[PDB]
Design a binder for this molecule. Sequence first.
Ligand SMILES: [Mg+2]
Ligand SMILES: [Mg+2]
Lengths: 318, 99, 90, 37, 88
Amino acid sequence: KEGITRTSNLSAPIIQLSGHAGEVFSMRFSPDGQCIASGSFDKTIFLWRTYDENENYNVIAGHRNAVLEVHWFTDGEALLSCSADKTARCWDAETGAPIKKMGEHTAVVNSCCPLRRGAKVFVTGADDSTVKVWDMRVKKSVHTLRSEFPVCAVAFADAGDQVYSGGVDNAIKVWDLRRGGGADVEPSMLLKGHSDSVTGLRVSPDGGHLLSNAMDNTLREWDVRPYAPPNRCTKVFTGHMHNFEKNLLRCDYAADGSKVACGSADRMVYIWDTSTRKLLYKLPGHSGSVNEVVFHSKEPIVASASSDKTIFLGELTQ
Amino acid sequence: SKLLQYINFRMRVTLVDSRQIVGRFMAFDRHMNLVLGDSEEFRRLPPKKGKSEEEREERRVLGLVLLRGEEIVSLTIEGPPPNPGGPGIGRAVGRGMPA
Amino acid sequence: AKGIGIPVKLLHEAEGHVVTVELKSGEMYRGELCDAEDNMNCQLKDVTATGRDGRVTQLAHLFIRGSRVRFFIIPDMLKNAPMFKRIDPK
Amino acid sequence: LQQKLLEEKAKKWAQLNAKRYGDKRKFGFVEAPKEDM
Amino acid sequence: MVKLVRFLMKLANETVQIELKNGTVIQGTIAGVDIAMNTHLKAVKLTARGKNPVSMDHLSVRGNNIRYYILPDSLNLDTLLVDIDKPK
RNA sequence: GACGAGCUGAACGCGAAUAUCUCUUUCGCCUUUUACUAAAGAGAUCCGCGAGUUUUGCUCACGCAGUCGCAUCUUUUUGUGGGGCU
RNA sequence: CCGAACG
Ligand SMILES: [Mg+2]
Ligand SMILES: [Mg+2]
């Protein structure tokens, strides 16, 4: 009955992931697309399989406060967790052991992004208005830039030399780390056009486009190509929501650059078609503000995480 | 000692009479005694012109041997050593709708 | 005992077996070691002597000074000594 | 903006990320057992 | 406690040469010397009597068959010469 | 190559203390039922109890620190050297 | 051994 074109191998087209005991603040799909890293407010990371049971086969603990942001490392076996307990942590996924815990920040480490081409290096931007760059094998932080306003969202560019940081200061900045080996570098690019804070930053699958979610209830698409018009602003999306919760609401690109998914505070999973700049999917089902949405590496699968201690995991039909 | 880094690692030995012993490392004594597993004696015969130095060094197979340091002069490496489910569930559920 | 390294207790637990003895002079000695010293002086019985010239001789007993001896050849059977296994990574 | 608002906006975000992730507020927190009267 | 093996065990990471009792030549870096004068060398090349050199990533040499050491010309001897009278 | 008292949580487990109950039977009180007796069994409950990190509440406390990446006479690290024959 | 209720 109803036989509507099963896309994925998942048992069902809509799967809810439960087992957390707090808000789920950020999630991430394995590069090989058969793992889930879910970081909750309960300062814990659930590791789920994407197929055949959706088994949370490991719960990694070790943060003393909410694990606000999780990415995987480029090979998928090491995990980068960032928290409110001022401590970013590198873990081994298969094992259940923590590898390297760096806690150099003074306040909540809101945002992080690990570099996708090059060395094992990740940026982390926290409440101290400082965006710091962290190389894996040294135990000191390799870079430290100081804005004046608490850093909400940070990303490392496709190519690996600049860092994007956006926060409460109404303008997102692009900085050059090789241009800066000093302790008070000044910003390279000032993307303006959001009318208040930025909450989430995603680097496009080609690297020319940066996605910014703003509590300006606006998704904005900028181009980072060093040869741009005077206004790097390309696209605007309307539809999602930000409320008094001021949660860390993020961005994502479909693995093809064809869709863009935002987490919203109206409990809705929003998925726009980037081209027509209009709303493809408006999926309900979450009882709390939708914190981050992640598109599965291979298939059109979208998985969302909410402040309702669950994660919906399903495929898109049209 | 750092030759604790070297137990199970295959090694070659020189004697004072310049006879060669190749085996794998088992246990070592303070007196530079050694325990060689799978040991064989390579004794250098004089090089008779027209043949490679590498192709006719007399190999005898000694088996398991133990080495007294007094005539132990030099040791080198020969080769390598020879050869939580968590409280999560996933269940299928439709997404609820407000109307 | 305390102070003593492993391989000489290897030599001791080799007791009651037939082993081979190479000394620094180059001749070979195959026989049943009765018991040995801290100083590697050992007593074998049922002694086969292999001289420098291939000479094969029959000796009833042998007492070998250790600082005369170059190495020992011992059955890999006894390479299962508890030291060997215990130290082993597995 | 121009620190004529960004001062209090940044400070409010600071104090709210403080309050939201406090030790009285965090997950495993247990409240202290009752004291004697 | 003699003076000189007291001096020799501080030759760690010294890139030095060695002459053997029978006439073999060895140039390599001292990773360790111990109370028996036995040395383990790194970054080594050993050249036997009348033989071609062969390089070794690492090498072990017995303290007793050592003929002698050739130390660096760049040696602060009087640095390593203090403390030899000090019992620890 | 290295550091706890008190409470509630742990989730696993019954030194010497033992009471009650239920059930299936027999026995004895014996008019009946409770309430009982004493045997056989099968089942519960109570009152308590031990260790793992969870920390809440110290009112204790710390880092050139106790430890770091066997020392010259016949038996061991002060070797018996030198030559030369197939 | 040993006492209470009810009928
Ligand atoms: Mg009646
Ligand atoms: Mg009546």
